[PDB]
Design a protein around this ligand. Sequence first.
Ligand SMILES: O=C(O)C1=C[C@@H](OP(=O)(O)O)[C@@H](O)[C@H](O[C@@](OP(=O)(O)O)(C(=O)O)C(F)F)C1
Length: 445
Amino acid sequence: SSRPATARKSSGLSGTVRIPGDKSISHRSFMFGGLASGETRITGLLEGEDVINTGKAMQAMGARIRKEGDTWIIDGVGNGGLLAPEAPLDFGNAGTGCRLTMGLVGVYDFDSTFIGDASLTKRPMGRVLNPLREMGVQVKSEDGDRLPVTLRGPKTPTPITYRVPMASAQVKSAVLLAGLNTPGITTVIEPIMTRDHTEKMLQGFGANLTVETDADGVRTIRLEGRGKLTGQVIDVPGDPSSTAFPLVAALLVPGSDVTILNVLMNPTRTGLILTLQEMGADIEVINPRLAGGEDVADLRVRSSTLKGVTVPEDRAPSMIDEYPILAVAAAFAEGATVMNGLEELRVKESDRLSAVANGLKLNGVDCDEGETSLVVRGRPDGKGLGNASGAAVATHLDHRIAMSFLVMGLVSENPVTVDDATMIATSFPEFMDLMAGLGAKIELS
Ligand SMILES: O=C(O)C1=C[C@@H](OP(=O)(O)O)[C@@H](O)[C@H](O[C@@](OP(=O)(O)O)(C(=O)O)C(F)F)C1
């Protein structure tokens, strides 16, 4: 079952906190550490349920994973060394773990079955299964290419040149991981850049992987298959998607001054910050530095008055997971915020466009949901927003919908209630404690 939570209007949020590790990089740390030759040591790993599930899947295939002190230590099997899993690989709510692992293991000559929760089971896998079919993988899936899915790789996979049809880092990632156990050169062409953790990390593990960007922005990513991968020391940066919740809360709640430490600033992950700045947000980037091979900085955020803006379709890939929290910020901005190019939101943990639109309307916000867009008109003072009757926002098992609306309740005249807070631990188990520490009033059922 589920457990509702209600956020109440708060006086200023104040403090300095370290945000939990980046989920995208954490998944990949377990995957590459488990596949590589030798030992991989990870500090700052996100210990949310999603990442733990990826770790269990890697253990099921031969990697030894353990936590010594604050460091995760992995003994990898070496590229080409994955062992046939005894049972289905359960990815729970994690699209990333599921999609990437399908590419990783689908090209091995043994059966692998993939299962997950009610949310993951409704999401499209065709975007990853199609290129795998081209590579020679045999696929048994449910209608619409949905889980459960059983894969059986060929004795010798076929390397392909695949142009990713939508701006998905997961599809790009799955094809590159499939390429690791495929002889020849696997090439992924990305017309619009998506988060590049797979490319950067594989290069760090020693893969012969190159990225060439045409002057028009198109990326050609080449990977030589069946090459050695060497265990690495990894230092995981703070999650910029998780940072978005206390960051927007500090912008919206009057009398606020919050500093978030060690935040990943890779530009494929900072579209929300750029957008909020255009809206008038007071976000100071402090001590930008290089840590664990990634750009990081600390962010000092103070209460700001915001004005609606137009958010272009080409900025979407760089903030795709932050549209829910951006929609909440827009509900308190002067004027209209217009966001298009949102088709991808409909296939996430929940259809995020529909879930955000319904939640906003339930909480008195004037907005228009289009097939691939959202327009939100705000009420800066928060009057008439929220839900006095205590009606709950339907989260549809999507932890980002739950966190976004809980942030809204810290600002609206009336409290905001979400029907379930249990999925927040999939990527941000520290959420309740972290927000409470800053002064937020959130009551869990
Ligand atoms: O490769 C990655 O690490 C991710 C790539 C993106 O998906 P696409 O390739 O489909 O654009 C994100 O939207 C996804 O984040 C979510 O990732 P999960 O499904 O839960 O794993 C999220 O955290 O909200 C989202 F997809 F739901 C994580």
